[PDB]
Amino acid sequence: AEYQNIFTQVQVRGPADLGMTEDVNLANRSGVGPFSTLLGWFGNAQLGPIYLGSLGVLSLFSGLMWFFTIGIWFWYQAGWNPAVFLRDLFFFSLEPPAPEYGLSFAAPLKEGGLWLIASFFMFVAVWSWWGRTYLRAQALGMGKHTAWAFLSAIWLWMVLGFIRPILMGSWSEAVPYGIFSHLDWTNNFSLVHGNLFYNPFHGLSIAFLYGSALLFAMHGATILAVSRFGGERELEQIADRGTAAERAALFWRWTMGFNATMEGIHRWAIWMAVLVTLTGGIGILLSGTVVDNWYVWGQNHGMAPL
Amino acid sequence: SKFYKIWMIFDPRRVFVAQGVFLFLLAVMIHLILLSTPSYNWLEISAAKYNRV
């Protein structure tokens, strides 16, 4: 019966906001796109403008090549049949070369070479996007927290696709490009290394993924509960603490016995999120290269009855 | 009668769109059921009559 502030009840539109021109080449920035009332019911209605620099276009074209390579392989697997393509869309897979090729690049296209091509494209796209996040932060004079938070996820991705295959000595260890295919790869990876549940770093990574869900629920709910005091304007609460920040702090102080500040809760948030992929990459790197049976390792380290 | 009062409460536009979706779903379902029964698949029946397959 009361307004929960989940959806805006009255939308307001003014002149298009071009943004802050700190050091941004206004040539690279595109024009403001359309206004989406559907998106405006939940957040901002404005689309664009989007910046397109050197790294932006490099990453966009490299990612387009990766996506197109996978899609053309999928069309080949369908026998160029659109009905088959739609029927088996989730069952298609661009697989890495068989283990007998090792890390060599001399695998046939149908048996792993096209996977290497798509992998190179993806590698370029992701690293150019990382540089792009760093440079976009730099142009506006902001800190580089987004770049390092992205670097954590990039490290999990690199361990999965690049570093662990090299350590294990074959491209066959890497992840195929496919919807159900990479799910099968995940399940098989767990089975081969003996119940990845007993990997300590898989356990910590899950602790932090659960903790990210918990913490974003807590933080979103807290900010919505104090939005009646302008609590969603967190930067001004950092600069000039209002009653929203105090009420949020006191809620969690009286509930848990300790609280955060408007600025430090975001340190909690960023670390809780990055630890997911950081710990996960460590665990995946250890799997196979150091421990090949995590249940037996568990038994030898407590964690499981002998 | 006095049925036009039904337009004094419900938005005409969404009524018409919902009616169109409902009618299309029903017609498609009825035709598909007729196809499912081999004794009313007019393509199959015509193939049997004209010795097509």
């Binding site: 959806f7 | 969404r14 769109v17």
Partner: peptide
């Protein structure tokens, strides 16, 4: 949208 939320296409259009 929740007022017309009591398939989804009826509220969608």
């Amino acid at each position: 949208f929740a007022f017309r939320l009591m398939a989804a296409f009826f509220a969608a259009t």
